Amino acid sequence: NGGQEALEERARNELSMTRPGETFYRLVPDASKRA
Amino acid sequence: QRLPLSKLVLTGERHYTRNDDIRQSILALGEPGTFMTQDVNIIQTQIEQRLPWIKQVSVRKQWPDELKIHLVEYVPIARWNDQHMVDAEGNTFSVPPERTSKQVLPMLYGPEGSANEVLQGYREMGQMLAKDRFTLKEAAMTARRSWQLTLNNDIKLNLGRGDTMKRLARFVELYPVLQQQAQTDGKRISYVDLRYDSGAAVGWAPLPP
Ligand SMILES: [Mg+2]
Ligand SMILES: [Mg+2]
């Protein structure tokens, strides 16, 4: 199945989910915190 | 009073071999005393088993009284799966941990046969990362082929399964912003997790007191 790693790999890549506590930076062109 | 009868001479660059290890190989063999007649080739095929860190053993004899043994050791680039080593070409071997063991050697991880695979990545990412001010402490491939790099700091980079040169590309671009945010809060970047088209999630940690 992949288990807990293939599940998490997907949630990040396809949904851009993070974990509690992590700051997220997207680069739609330039770096950008949550702000 | 003592003085030698059969002499033993060793040649070539050797870091992990003690001179006694060769001696103990010849002596711990059969019929000790047939010392420069016990086949020069049998003594190769004995130094090689008893020592997995010798790449090559080159044995000749020089009449009257000496035995000349040329050794090439495996020069390791990394510590494979904590308990082995590997050299440039992918060859895996071992050493006593009683030996040097205070070596500044990286550590590669991966499945059983994948030590050459992991080496590939370790070269390709260590290269681009060293093109900036970054050196690789660890690099771990899983079975699923997802890479996780611990860096010169204790900054882990989870690169997932895909666009790996793009993803640690994206980390190098970001690192300044991360360091700024790291001090304006007084925390250390624990990981940066890059399993995102265009994105990165950073986990922060407190910092040693
Ligand atoms: Mg690669
Ligand atoms: Mg991935």
Numbering used by the authors:
A (entry chain B): 272 to 306
B (entry chain A): 4 to 212
Tell me, in the authors' exact words, what the paper reports.
Bacterial cell division is a fundamental process that results in the physical separation of a mother cell into two daughter cells and involves a set of proteins known as the divisome. Early and late components are linked by the FtsQBL complex, which is well-conserved among bacteria. The FtsQBL complex may have a structural role as a scaffold in the assembly of the divisome since FtsB and FtsL proteins are recruited to the divisome by FtsQ and the resulting FtsQBL complex then recruits late divisome components. In this study, we have determined the crystal structure of the periplasmic domain of FtsQ in complex with C-terminal fragment of FtsB, showing that the C-terminal region of FtsB is a key binding region of FtsQ.
